[PDB]
From Swiss-Prot, chain C:
Changing residue 20 to L: In strain: Omicron/BA.1. The chain holds residues 352 to 395 of 1273 of the full protein. Attaches the virion to the cell membrane by interacting with host receptor, initiating the infection. The major receptor is host ACE2. When S2/S2' has been cleaved, binding to the receptor triggers direct fusion at the cell membrane. When S2/S2' has not been cleaved, binding to the receptor results in internalization of the virus by endocytosis using host TFRC and GRM2 and leading to fusion of the virion membrane with the host endosomal membrane. Alternatively, may use NRP1/NRP2 and integrin as entry receptors. Binds to host ACE2. RBD also interacts with the N-linked glycan on 'Asn-90' of ACE2. Cleavage of S generates a polybasic C-terminal sequence on S1 that binds to host Neuropilin-1 (NRP1) and Neuropilin-2 (NRP2) receptors. Interacts with host integrin alpha-5/beta-1 (ITGA5:ITGB1) and with ACE2 in complex with integrin alpha-5/beta-1 (ITGA5:ITGB1). May interact via cytoplasmic c-terminus with M protein. May interact (via N-terminus) with host bilirubin and biliverdin, thereby preventing antibody binding to the SARS-CoV-2 spike NTD via an allosteric mechanism. It comes from the Viruses. Changing residue 22 to P: In strain: Omicron/BA.1, Omicron/BA.2, Omicron/BA.2.12.1, Omicron/BA.2.75, Omicron/BA.4, Omicron/BA.5, Omicron/BQ.1.1, Omicron/XBB.1.5, Omicron/EG.5.1. This is Spike protein S1.
């Protein structure tokens, strides 16, 4: 089978969001003012 | 006398002393 | 239990609050201006 099985341990975890940000892949990531 | 809730806003130097279920119409504590 | 539901990144609708029951007790916020509120965490 296929499963992610990563070390989530999402204890006291409050932010959840669902989308389709999949598919050469260029990306830029920044954390600005929250 | 008390600062109860007012649905309207006030203007400078305005003196107005004249819907939250049943709490809009009433209007200190001396202890 | 108490103080378990975390509210954020959500539409914090108050219609479900002031138009419910016939259940409010809003102290710390403006009762008829609740829909104009925004907080860091609820």
């Amino acid at each position: 089978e296929s499963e992610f099985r990563v070390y989530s341990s999402a204890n006291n975890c409050t932010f959840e969001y669902v989308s389709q940000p999949f598919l050469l892949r260029e990306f830029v990531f920044k954390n600005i003012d929250g | 006398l008390y600062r109860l809730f007012r649905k309207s806003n006030l203007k400078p130097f305005e003196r107005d002393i004249s819907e939250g279920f049943n709490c809009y119409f009433p209007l200190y504590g001396f202890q | 239990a108490w103080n378990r539901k975390r509210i954020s990144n959500c539409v914090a609708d108050y219609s479900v609050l002031y138009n419910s029951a016939s259940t409010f007790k809003c102290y710390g916020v403006s009762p008829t201006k609740l829909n104009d509120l925004c907080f860091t965490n609820v």
